């Protein structure tokens, strides 16, 4: 019963030093565990790919999986209060049943809400903010066990959602909602990079509510284009690529059964925004991930820099996805303060082969002020990375106020706060 266990992230490339995952079964127990522990980090659903959740030797790794997962919709207010450990699939089910909806979702819905917003998680669409952008309040258990609630409008709130877990344990969050809406997903194949000029790139990325491009970086250009269209908005002809003949997966050869419905068949928002259907429930994945988030005005130059090194990228690549994100108010969001283009890479799970490719990719993106996704694999040096965040000092002051001893600062966060 008392024997050591091995605790990893979802993809299993990160093995934590913790020999047990503590899952307190009450908020009283959680407060006491936090107060009594010298160093703490929280594990959500483990869909990070780096050391962000590692608390160091002797540090406590705790989870909310032992507490009830509550999803409380106020229909008149159009809000939902959720536990930090609740995952997006359940959140979406419950809000949809109340006739309400989120403005966006990530690719796969089986990810914790608190952990998603902690790192900058986003979907696509030129007018759609990050997942954090709909949070209007957070509730934290701080280092001494006490609760601090921070709401939108509080001078601190810009640092309180996407915080890398550095302020305390987020026990609940409240999100804003909109009326439930219908969508259609239309997939296309073969979009050239040649002739993808500023006007055409803008037209393509704005052609639906959320648009992704996918490529293998093998033949020139893009292999797929996914349009996720609201039925309450117009859909113009899309002459730029061929209509897909078959149901598609982002990664060529992987099972398209896993993916949300295509061929433009209408269905609800939460069955169209993700790329992966709720029924698809993988307990791990044999992959790594990286993503770089740049000013949207650099999209073409960045795509052209990556095209020039395509032969270096391709051998370790499962798929690359290009997305857009609206400017974020959160100080540590990779989309902070600027409309954004994102370049995501799902790699083969071969750390030794991937890291040198990541380093070369990062070099290629330096001219475009690329910020890495905090949840994913990156090798940007700490000082260089700190220089990319205008309000980093403000964040550090907030962390110092709420957590003076740095109970929630691990090695990952320490390099951000240095
Ligand atoms: C696995 C995965 C991830 C993923 C994705 C697809 C898959 C298969 N698609 C994404 C996408 O479309 N867009 C996007 O921007 N990200 C996508 N991701 C990445 C993923 O969403 C993030 O890496 C996310 O942060 C993972 O959250 P999760 O909860 O699974 O991961 P974690 O390692 O356990 O924790 C991450 C950080 O959050 C802190 N955390 C977690 N819970 C809390 C609470 N309650 N309070 C304070 N912090 C918390 C962790 O400590 C860690 O720092
Ligand atoms: Cl091309």
Structural summary, described in words:
The structure is a monomer. The protein is α+β, with helices and mostly antiparallel strands and 418 residues long. It folds into 5 domains: 1-69, 2-Layer Sandwich (Uridine Diphospho-n-acetylenolpyruvylglucosamine Reductase, domain 2); 70-181 and 269-286, 2-Layer Sandwich (Uridine Diphospho-n-acetylenolpyruvylglucosamine Reductase, domain 3); 182-268, 2-Layer Sandwich (Alpha-Beta Plaits); 287-380, Alpha-Beta Plaits (2-Layer Sandwich); 381-418, Vanillyl-alcohol Oxidase, Chain A, domain 4 (Orthogonal Bundle). Helix content is 21%, strand content 23%. The chain contains 10 helices and 18 strands. The chain has helices spanning 27-36, 88-97, 113-119, 198-205, 299-308, 310-313, 351-365, 382-386, 392-402, 411-417; strands spanning 40-42, 60-62, 71-74, 79-83, 100-101, 135-141, 147-151, 169-176, 178-179, 182-191, 210-215, 222-230, 242-243, 267-268, 288-295, 317-325, 340-347, 371-372. Strands 10, 11, 12, 13, 14, 15, 16, 17 and 18 form a 9-stranded antiparallel beta sheet that branches. The chain has a 5-stranded antiparallel beta sheet with strand order 3-4-8-6-7. A hairpin with a 5-residue loop joins strand 6 and strand 7. The longest helix has 15 residues, at 351-365. The protein is globular. The two termini are 40 Å apart. The structure holds flavin-adenine dinucleotide and chloride ion.
């Amino acid at each position: 019963f008392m024997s050591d266990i091995t605790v990893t992230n979802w993809a299993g490339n990160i093995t934590y030093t913790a020999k047990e995952l503590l899952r307190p079964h009450s908020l009283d127990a959680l407060r006491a565990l936090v107060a009594d522990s010298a160093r703490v980090r929280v594990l959500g659903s483990g869909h990070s790919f780096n050391e962000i959740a590692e608390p160091g030797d002797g540090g406590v790794l705790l989870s909310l999986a032992g507490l009830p997962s509550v999803v409380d919709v106020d229909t008149a207010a159009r809000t939902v209060r959720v536990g930090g450990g609740v995952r997006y699939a359940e959140l979406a089910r419950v809000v949809h049943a109340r006739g309400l909806a989120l403005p966006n979702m990530a690719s796969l819905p089986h990810i914790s809400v608190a952990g998603s917003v902690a790192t900058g998680t986003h979907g696509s669409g030129v007018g759609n903010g990050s997942l954090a952008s709909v949070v209007r309040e957070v509730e934290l258990v701080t280092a001494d066990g006490s609760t601090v609630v921070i709401a939108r409008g509080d001078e601190r709130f810009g640092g309180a959602v996407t915080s890398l877990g550095a302020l305390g344990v987020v026990t609940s969050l409240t999100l804003d909602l909109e009326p439930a809406y219908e969508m259609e997903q239309h997939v296309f194949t073969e979009l050239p990079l040649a002739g993808l000029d500023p006007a055409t790139f803008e037209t393509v990325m704005a052609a639906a509510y959320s648009v992704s491009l996918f490529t293998d970086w093998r033949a020139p250009g893009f292999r797929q284009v996914w349009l996720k269209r609201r039925t309450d908005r117009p859909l113009d002809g899309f002459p730029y690529a061929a209509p897909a003949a078959e149901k598609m997966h982002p990664v060529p050869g992987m099972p398209a059964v896993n993916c949300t419905e295509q061929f433009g068949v209408p269905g609800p928002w939460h069955e169209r925004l993700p790329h992966f259907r709720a029924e698809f429930t993988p307990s791990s994945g044999a992959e790594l991930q990286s993503e770089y988030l740049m000013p949207r005005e650099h999209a073409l130059a960045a795509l052209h820099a990556m095209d020039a090194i395509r032969e270096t990228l391709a051998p370790v690549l499962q798929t690359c996805e290009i997305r857009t994100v609206a400017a974020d108010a959160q100080w540590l969001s990779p989309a902070y303060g600027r409309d954004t283009v994102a370049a995501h890479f799902t790699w083969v799970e071969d750390t030794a082969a991937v890291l040198p490719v990541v380093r070369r990719l990062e070099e290629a993106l330096v001219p475009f002020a690329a910020r890495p996704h905090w949840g994913k694999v990156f090798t940007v040096p700490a000082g260089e990375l700190r220089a990319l965040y205008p309000r980093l000092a403000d964040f550090g002051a907030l962390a110092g106020a709420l957590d003076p001893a740095g109970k929630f600062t691990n090695a990952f966060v320490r390099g951000v706060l240095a």
